[PDB]
């Protein structure tokens, strides 16, 4: 709560305090606010890694629908997780939502074989 | 082996291990790096165990490949008592349906009904 209030009182020019807040919020297992901070700073790659690492798949999917460039970063880990659960129909849909259409085809060809 | 490892081609390395008869290594590579072939590798290994006349271990690996529903009855079709023991041990619905169809063709309708009732196959 205090790191949030500080990060909200800090200016957008204060990168070193803001990145120290975001890294402490990650270290303190507070990914929704580390996410708000990475979003305020515009570092979308660290944000999607944060949501995939903290396994917040719903927040990840919502970010990937807003920023199509991260569909691969979210659905590759999730589609691998579906394929490892033998949920290959759902995994094939997940690889497709990732933009990984060639792998969505190759997995189904491999299952057909 | 070193070349296939250097390529990161765990699929060709798994086929290689199978062809070399090194099934344990093949299963380890399938379990860690080639999870999509793992059912197929268990099925092929079960086929080689069946060919090697080790039916008990073949059963365990057909079960792991989830192909026991059609491969086990094929393999034990010559030894009916063992198949009956197996069907009674797994308590699987699909297997009780198959065993009831076998009893139905042999005319043992009272036993077929008993196993269709166990299988919940009201039809």
UniProtKB/Swiss-Prot annotation, chain A:
Coiled coil: none
Superkingdom in the source lineage: Eukaryota
Localization terms from the record: Cell projection, Cilium; Cytoplasm, Cytoskeleton, Cilium basal body
Tissues where this protein is expressed: Expressed in many tissues. Predominant expression in testis and pituitary.
Known partners and oligomeric status: Component of the IFT complex A (IFT-A) complex. IFT-A complex is divided into a core subcomplex composed of IFT122:IFT140:WDR19 which is associated with TULP3 and a peripheral subcomplex composed of IFT43:WDR35:TTC21B. Interacts with IFT43:WDR35; the interaction connects the 2 IFT-A subcomplexes. Interacts with IFTAP; the interaction associates IFTAP with IFT-A complex.
Disease tied to this protein: Cranioectodermal dysplasia 1: A disorder characterized by craniofacial, skeletal and ectodermal abnormalities. Clinical features include dolichocephaly (with or without sagittal suture synostosis), scaphocephaly, short stature, limb shortening, short ribs, narrow chest, brachydactyly, renal failure and hepatic fibrosis, small and abnormally shaped teeth, sparse hair, skin laxity and abnormal nails.
Domain remarks in the Swiss-Prot or TrEMBL record: Forms the trimeric core subcomplex IFT122:IFT140:WDR19 via the C-terminal region, whereas it interacts with IFT43:WDR35 via the N-terminal region containing the WD repeats.
Task performed by this protein: As a component of the IFT complex A (IFT-A), a complex required for retrograde ciliary transport and entry into cilia of G protein-coupled receptors (GPCRs), it is required in ciliogenesis and ciliary protein trafficking. Involved in cilia formation during neuronal patterning. Acts as a negative regulator of Shh signaling. Required to recruit TULP3 to primary cilia.
Entry protein name: Intraflagellar transport protein 122 homolog
Organism of derivation: Homo sapiens (Human)
Phylogenetic placement of the source organism: Eukaryota, Metazoa, Chordata, Craniata, Vertebrata
This protein's encoding gene: IFT122
Positions spanned in the full protein: 791 to 903 of 1241
From Swiss-Prot, chain B:
Subunit structure: Component of the IFT complex A (IFT-A). IFT-A complex is divided into a core subcomplex composed of IFT122:IFT140:WDR19 which is associated with TULP3 and a peripheral subcomplex composed of IFT43:WDR35:TTC21B. Interacts (via C-terminal region) with IFT122 (via C-terminal region). Interacts with TTC25. Interacts with TTC21A.
Intervals holding TPR repeats: 7-42, 44-72, 93-123
Compartment(s) of residence: Cytoplasm, Cytoskeleton, Cilium basal body; Cytoplasm, Cytoskeleton, Microtubule organizing center, Centrosome; Cell projection, Cilium
Descriptive protein name: Intraflagellar transport protein 140 homolog
Disease annotated for this entry: Short-rib thoracic dysplasia 9 with or without polydactyly: A form of short-rib thoracic dysplasia, a group of autosomal recessive ciliopathies that are characterized by a constricted thoracic cage, short ribs, shortened tubular bones, and a 'trident' appearance of the acetabular roof. Polydactyly is variably present. Non-skeletal involvement can include cleft lip/palate as well as anomalies of major organs such as the brain, eye, heart, kidneys, liver, pancreas, intestines, and genitalia.
Effect of residue 9 to C: In RP80; uncertain significance
Highest taxon above the source species: Eukaryota
Protein purpose: Component of the IFT complex A (IFT-A), a complex required for retrograde ciliary transport and entry into cilia of G protein-coupled receptors (GPCRs). Plays a pivotal role in proper development and function of ciliated cells through its role in ciliogenesis and/or cilium maintenance. Required for the development and maintenance of the outer segments of rod and cone photoreceptor cells. Plays a role in maintenance and the delivery of opsin to the outer segment of photoreceptor cells.
Gene encoding the protein: IFT140
Full protein stretch here: 863 to 985 of 1462
